[PDB]
């Protein structure tokens, strides 16, 4: 069941290690999640940090099909295409379905209003660094459900946790 009154979702790839990011870019490559990735936000409104916004191609800025909301403490940034608003308060405005889809100093701030997690395991070979973006944990009020393993075109091992509250 999906609820559709206000709901906020949170969807990342991180590593096993917890790895989300590194050095501005993802750092493995598994083309099923981009796959993944649109299927669950094509056509919403999903938020993100100026870092993820940076951190897009030139080709998917803004990210086509879906409202793109952008948070800076910057006055007057500018992001072509896409929305910037200074607060969570105003990035979540809308009642429509709306994802938060990074990094992580955006999980960490709209975790205490969600209520999905679409989350993507990666089995990469990726000690965590200390500068490194990382992975929101995942506290006991969180049901759901694991995939199996699957194989990437690009070798690496996947797969997909869906979680709810
Ligand atoms: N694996 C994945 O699923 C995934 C998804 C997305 C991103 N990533 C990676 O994660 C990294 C980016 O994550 P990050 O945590 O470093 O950065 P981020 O969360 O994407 O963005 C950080 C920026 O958000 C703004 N911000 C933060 N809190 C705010 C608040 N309360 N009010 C207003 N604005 C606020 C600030 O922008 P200003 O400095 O402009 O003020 C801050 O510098 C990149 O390497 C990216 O590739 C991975
Ligand atoms: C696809 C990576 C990704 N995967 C998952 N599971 N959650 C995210 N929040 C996420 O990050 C979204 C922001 C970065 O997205 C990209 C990064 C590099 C190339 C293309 C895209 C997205 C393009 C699109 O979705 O149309």
């Known amino acids: 069941?999906?609820?559709?009154?206000?709901?906020?979702?949170?969807?990342?790839?991180?590593?096993?290690?917890?790895?989300?990011?590194?050095?501005?870019?993802?750092?493995?490559?598994?083309?099923?999640?981009?796959?993944?990735?649109?299927?669950?936000?094509?056509?919403?409104?999903?938020?993100?940090?100026?870092?993820?916004?940076?951190?897009?191609?030139?080709?998917?800025?803004?990210?086509?099909?879906?409202?793109?909301?952008?948070?800076?403490?910057?006055?007057?940034?500018?992001?072509?295409?896409?929305?910037?608003?200074?607060?969570?308060?105003?990035?979540?405005?809308?009642?429509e379905d709306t994802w938060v889809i990074g990094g992580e100093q955006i999980y960490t701030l709209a975790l205490p209003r969600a209520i999905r997690c679409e989350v993507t395991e990666v089995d990469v070979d990726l000690p965590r660094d200390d500068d490194d973006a990382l992975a929101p944990p995942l506290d006991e009020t969180w049901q759901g459900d694991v995939g199996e393993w699957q194989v990437s075109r690009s070798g690496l091992r996947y797969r997909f946790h869906s979680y709810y509250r």
């Open 1 to 95: 069941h999906h609820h559709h009154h206000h709901m906020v979702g949170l969807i990342w790839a991180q590593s096993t290690s917890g790895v989300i990011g590194r050095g501005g870019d993802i750092p493995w490559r598994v083309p099923e999640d981009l796959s993944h990735f649109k299927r669950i936000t094509m056509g919403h409104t999903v938020v993100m940090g100026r870092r993820t916004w940076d951190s897009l191609p030139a080709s998917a800025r803004p990210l086509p099909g879906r409202r793109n909301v952008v948070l800076s403490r910057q006055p007057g940034f500018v992001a072509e295409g896409a929305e910037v608003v200074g607060s969570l308060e105003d990035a979540l405005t809308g009642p």
